[model samples]
Target: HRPEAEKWLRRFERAPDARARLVCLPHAGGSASFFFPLAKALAPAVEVLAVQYPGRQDRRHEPPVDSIGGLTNRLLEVLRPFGDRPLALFGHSMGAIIGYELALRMPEAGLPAPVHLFASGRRAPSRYRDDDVRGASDERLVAELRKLGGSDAAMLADPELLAMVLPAIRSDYRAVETYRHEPGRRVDCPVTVFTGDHDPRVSVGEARAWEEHTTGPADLRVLPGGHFFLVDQAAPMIATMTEKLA
Candidate 1:
């Protein structure tokens, strides 16, 4: 086991026999530690667990997987231990895409799928219009992050943090930017697409379009804030999660 994975796993527990569990996926270049605050906010009935993908944080030495297939398979394996529970997925931006793919893969593989899928701050899979972002320069990418307004400015402004985080960001972008979702693979669970009203990447219409991806009921909520709305919108988000799981 990689030390980073062990460190984070020991550092936290999802929820102690909570009525429902919500596995939160972080944004690109982010680690499980990023959602610790949200986890605390979502205690008792709804436990919030975050997944730590390799190649970031203390796992910096591991080669990052920048392909959707690789990321999906790896995550599916790591997530196997939690398969027995009734859970859902809450993901932001690139994490949304990963969560979507994981849901699709889980049921296809005959494993238990989540009770619902919450895709936040991301366009639907087939609606991807951006080109491969791997070719973009570090300066240009930081510019995009700046525009998102949810990213930590310190990572952009401080050389050391940027150096530590940039690789994972780039790797994640490469995976997402290069992805081509196969046709006709929508998930079986209901999808709740959440987006900040001011997010430029996904308009209300685009977020609502996620409905087609699910066999269950679908909802699109325009929360107050920009792309990184989770900072101030934890309660609403958590309430929504609890409601959906209930």
Candidate 2:
């Protein structure tokens, strides 16, 4: 990794000469490693960068940001150097919210807005739910993670690992669940929303609501399965993204 990029971005597969760039943000409780496969698949055609949020992995000791706006502000700063290339944003679940927020603010800082914004496993930014889990008990939090299904059951069962991870997870939940979307804050870039057909968190109508947030084109793709459908349905999703991004 470039020393400057080390702060919050990770490049698993570098394609410096690629015409376009893809920056991915992981879902809540996820690390940059979540996009390892995506980085490999999108390489050469498009350079892939994944954001490494604080309070996880090697940065485990750093305090996590507890607000979505605060995190996005920092993310915008971390992304400045990559501005030389035309960039696209790909984010899943909580990441999707981050990506959308980032896209909105980039241009305000005289930076380029993403040419494309790919939001997965999350509802539109305009959609709000009162599902705050910041106050949930550890057991309840663990149960919610199990319900989401993206997390590893084994890891969840390992108390030691869970102890280390839960703080960051709870922080992420607080950042996202308590986020209140500002009504008129919209983006100019094209937006694409991907969701599981039966995702308990996001309905088809909720996914379609993304269309209202962008002046550019918007698309919604509903794949098979529930909240963590991307785990099983990654290939087609990647293919679709690759074609559109190319």
Candidate 3:
């Protein structure tokens, strides 16, 4: 599709004249559709451009990108038409690291760095811990997904569903789990890190390390929930993001 918006950016809700735009990136095994409700909630004031990574749902037949650096460049290239209005980024888990890397390269693409970058539900790229999920057995992989609370246990119970989601999930894990941050790489945009109080994958301190990745101001907010806190805290999350963009 030649980097067309239709092939990559899934705009579930749009406000062409909205003062600003918010681009959302999903986690492992997630699709652009995950942000549909969010786009609806932010309409008129802020447009939501949800990225649809390949190897999932409608893009299932497409091969998944296995390197964060490679994924970051592809996104940067495709976001060339970033409008005159301010643009912000919101990403979760695997998407968080991608968002961080994306912000770092926006200027190289001759595009403006986002006004704000919200890295949620994941540790800063600097905090590399050993996560074996990339090579884990099918049973352990499913257990990790369920433990993260992003997938429905009943749906995972269906062997057919597991078969379909596993490839994307494993590909993402290979990209993120074994990945380490390239030091000194930084963005000019303000950084905000969001993490659940009890998130298993990230510590509050680890989340706060995002400050080191940005030359601009940084803030960390610890909310109430597990890894996928934004799933249930949509209203509050959007409100906080809107407030920050101003």
Candidate 4:
């Protein structure tokens, strides 16, 4: 069920180029389509793939994994085909935590680790947590969405679409809030934190704190827009990643 649904983005799969594979994971409720433009921008230099979780898009009927450990294990299995290539991970929002967990899992299994990890729209795992958001009603959830400033008014106005998307959002929030990580033992790979200055969900301080999780040098990059800022700020971000990988 998962494999067939995830293969929706196979059109972008190239000849498995010798250059490192860049595995991208999407935010909560996001599909592989989100990274299609980014992959096109990367071109022949790197083969790019997006990780697709269940319960979204074509996999609408499939049950979504409700925890980080379960989600990461499922992803690691899906990722087996790409294990041979030198790989790096890029994830946003919920995807960021998934990427971090995947990196950790690989080492424990003696697999090659990602050359670089680019975590965007999320904070360092060690930061504070918010339990209040969980018990909020759907109306409050919508208000929280409005505060993030990522989703446009039109989407918010469309009750049908929002209705369909809410389950995934709630599940993702549950996964995030339920996560537990001990301090110390950060990833040895270089970590680059990307955030939006106006992002109400995650602050600049939280984003900058990702540095502590990396033994390698860590850096923070700020762009305009909030949460889904990549849509407005893709070019510069791509340029930075290309330069680093080059």
Instruction: Report, for all candidates in order, the number of backbone clashes.
Output: 0, 0, 0, 0
lDDT of 2 by residue, 1-246 (tens): 346457688889989788888889987778887787888988888988988888766676788888899888888878887778899999988999999998988998778878999999898888987653345576765775566453334456678777877988888987888887889878999898889998778989999999989999999889998767887899989988987887
Top lDDT model: 2
Order the candidate numbers by lDDT, best to worst.
2, 3, 4, 1
Of 1 and 3, which scores higher on lDDT? 3
lDDT against the true structure, per candidate, is 0.75, 0.83, 0.82, 0.76
TM-score of 2: 0.90
Backbone clash pairs for candidate 4 read none
Q: How close is candidate 3 to the true structure, as a TM-score?
A: 0.89
Q: Which pairs of residues collide in candidate 2? A: none
Could you give candidate 1's per-residue lDDT for residues 27-73 as a string of tens digits?
77667776777677777667777777776555656667777788778
Error of 3 at 115 (Å): 0.6
* TM-scores, each model vs. reference: 0.85, 0.90, 0.89, 0.84
lDDT of 2 at 87: 92
User: TM-score order of candidates, best first?
Assistant: 2, 3, 1, 4
Candidate 1, superposed: residue stretches over 4 Å from native: 1-14, 132-137, 140-161
Alpha-carbon RMSD, candidate 3: 2.7
Stretches of candidate 4 exceeding 4 Å from the true structure: 1-15, 131-164
Better of 2 and 3 by lDDT: 2
In angstroms, how far off is 104's CA in candidate 4? 1.5
